[PDB]
Amino acid sequence: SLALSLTADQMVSALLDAEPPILYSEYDPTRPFSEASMMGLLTNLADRELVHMINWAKRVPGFVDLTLHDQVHLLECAWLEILMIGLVWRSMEHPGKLLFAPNLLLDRNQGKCVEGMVEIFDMLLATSSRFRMMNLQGEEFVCLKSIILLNSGVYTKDHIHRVLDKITDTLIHLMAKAGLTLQQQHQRLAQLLLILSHIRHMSNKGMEHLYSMKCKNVVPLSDLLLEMLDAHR
């Protein structure tokens, strides 16, 4: 293996480089906000991001060393969590609103355009704020992302489990390097990993929402997103 020989500095540099490109949304201000139009907007953005998510994943160390079946599984499991953790990262410096994209800064009422939305929004916000409040650093963040990708799902895979314990060591290395004591170190480690739970949860609630929107047949969804959803029931 190669992902294991990498020092933390190397590990972090790799993940930092594998970052997906920032995307504009299809927002257009000549057409007003309807439930249909905003869901189409968010849903279009999601399809876009998914295409880059795939090629981002491959660049995550050791990921491309798994059987293609497992690479698929991890992504069918993780895509919305990944999507979310990104949104929540992207929104940290905007108390009150969600920075879906450079041209899409939504805030809480804009969400209750779409029935079911506002509840998930409230959580995405809460989580966002929590990261800002504990000063999450870009270097921790890319680690989180990866853990999220690698940790999604179940057992029937000890490969996956080593490259995770790697990422953990990297995490711990950052804090050490950032001037924490041993006890503050483990404490903050725990604090971040507990947050991952909230995202699983937000992810689950979203996925169901997205599914109810597909049926109601508000907006049509693109072939790829469509697959990532159906992968879940």
């Binding site: 920032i22 293609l68 994209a101 072939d223």
Partner: protein, 93 residues
Amino acid sequence: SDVPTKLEVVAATPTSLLISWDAPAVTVRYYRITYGETGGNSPVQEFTVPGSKSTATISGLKPGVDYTITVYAVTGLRLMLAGSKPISINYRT
């Protein structure tokens, strides 16, 4: 081949680019084209083209600037994973 190849700029105005590529030998659901000013570092634009097509125009570019264009073949999760790095090119308008 099995993923798009031979991407290139066919024609060009100060503000528009017409591009083409050799399609892969496969049902392609659709393509994504992304473009951005080269090493400008900003967010890139992106738009979709039906999979039966294999050319696209790009408009509203800043004259005389250098763009990076990349064509993404959207198939399925499995192929896309198995598939190769997407082909890209640089062209100054």
